[PDB]
Design a protein around this ligand. Structure first.
Ligand SMILES: N#Cc1ccc(Nc2nccc(C(=O)Nc3cnccc3-c3ccccc3)n2)cc1
Length: 347
């Protein structure tokens, strides 16, 4: 079964072309719509097709964001096209993206089910690539707003990580309010739990810190089906937020009473074989004050990633590590001096 469409390339100028594909199978479903896998007839390359319902009143925000992104750790929009679908008289937007076979969720689940942890070399590779993708999107004012393991795509043979699902992504403008109900259970920053509408891109850094801790532990660090349960788990690790810290993440919640828990030592939260650099990185990402958390680029420069910068490092499968040092001026713009650390002498 061959489907031919007239699709517009994602990057470059608006000059459509005939794209033919086959072997269409469903690989994802949800409130967003459906993600398919397909093979392009010309090259034989696998692609993913995200199909979503198109709002008649305005251009799809995810498409506007995707057309402006170009980074090795962000899934690439190859083409886009409009089509019919399940609901009659409704137009659908189809995003043809580069296909990535695995997710951090599935991979971590294998390890947790086998009563093991993912080797720290992979924790470093994946976490570093996530912080690069965040550094890049944050350099445009764009916040992902839904960082979680299912959104971190992985190619197991090359150890490449690609951030995906820009359905909640938004360019945050200071003074313009944002909906607080974005971000998934376990990964929500405490300002989002308190329903703040004036949050910054630093909510992605809290989410990434939750992913790091979960990869170190083998289970979520702040679980719970309600915000109050999530908050008790946060207070158990971080200690009680001060009135000042509470004011920094939604000031309308300053008069509420919180359980009095003393600041637990981060060394006791993880298994004894956990690298102290990973623990130090966690404590700097999972902070109450949104401005106290490391930026993505500062996290890339952390000592936990020094092994990645060694010229002799190789993947466990014997292959070379993927591209890690091809930083652009755009990507370094939050702190250009960091290139001194980020690009090692051998690169
Ligand atoms: N199981 C599975 C599985 C594993 C790998 C892929 N590969 C892949 N490759 C390129 C792009 C995308 C993509 O844009 N996905 C999404 C986009 N928007 C929302 C949600 C998703 C999504 C849904 C389910 C799982 C993970 C992401 N996914 C797909 C499914």
């Amino acid at each position: 079964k061959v489907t031919t469409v007239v699709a517009t390339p994602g990057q470059g100028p608006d000059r459509p072309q005939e794209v033919s594909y086959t072997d269409t199978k469903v690989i994802g479903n949800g409130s967003f719509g459906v993600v398919y896998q397909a093979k392009l007839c010309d090259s034989g390359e696998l692609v993913a097709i995200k199909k979503v319902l198109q709002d008649k009143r305005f251009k799809n925000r995810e498409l506007q964001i995707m057309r402006k992104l170009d980074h090795c750790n962000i899934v690439r929009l190859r083409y886009f096209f409009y089509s019919s679908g399940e609901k009659k008289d409704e137009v659908y937007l189809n995003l043809v993206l580069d296909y990535v076979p695995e997710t951090v969720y599935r991979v971590a689940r294998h390890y947790s089910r086998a009563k093991q942890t993912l080797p720290v070399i992979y924790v470093k590779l994946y976490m570093y690539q996530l912080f690069r993708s965040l550094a890049y999107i944050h350099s445009f004012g764009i916040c992902h707003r839904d960082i979680k393991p299912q959104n971190l795509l992985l190619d197991p043979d090359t150890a490449v990580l690609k951030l995906c699902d820009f359905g909640s992504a938004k360019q945050l403008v200071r003074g313009e309010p944002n909906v607080s109900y974005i971000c998934s259970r376990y990964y929500r920053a405490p300002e989002l739990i308190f329903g703040a509408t004036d949050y910054t891109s630093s909510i992605d850094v809290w989410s990434a810190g939750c992913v790091l801790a979960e990869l170190l532990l083998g289970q979520p660090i702040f679980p719970g089906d309600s915000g109050v349960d999530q908050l008790v788990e946060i207070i158990k690790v971080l200690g009680t937020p001060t009135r000042e810290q509470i004011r920094e993440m939604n000031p309308n919640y300053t008069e509420f009473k919180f359980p009095q828990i003393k600041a637990h030592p981060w060394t006791k939260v993880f298994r004894p074989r956990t690298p102290p650099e990973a623990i130090a990185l966690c404590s700097r990402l999972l902070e109450y004050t949104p401005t106290a958390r490391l930026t993505p680029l500062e996290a890339c420069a952390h000592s936990f990633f020094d092994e990645l910068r060694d010229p002799n490092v190789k993947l466990p499968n014997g292959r070379d590590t993927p591209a890690l040092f091809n930083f652009t001026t755009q990507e370094l713009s939050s702190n250009p001096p960091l290139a001194t650390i980020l690009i090692p002498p051998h690169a």
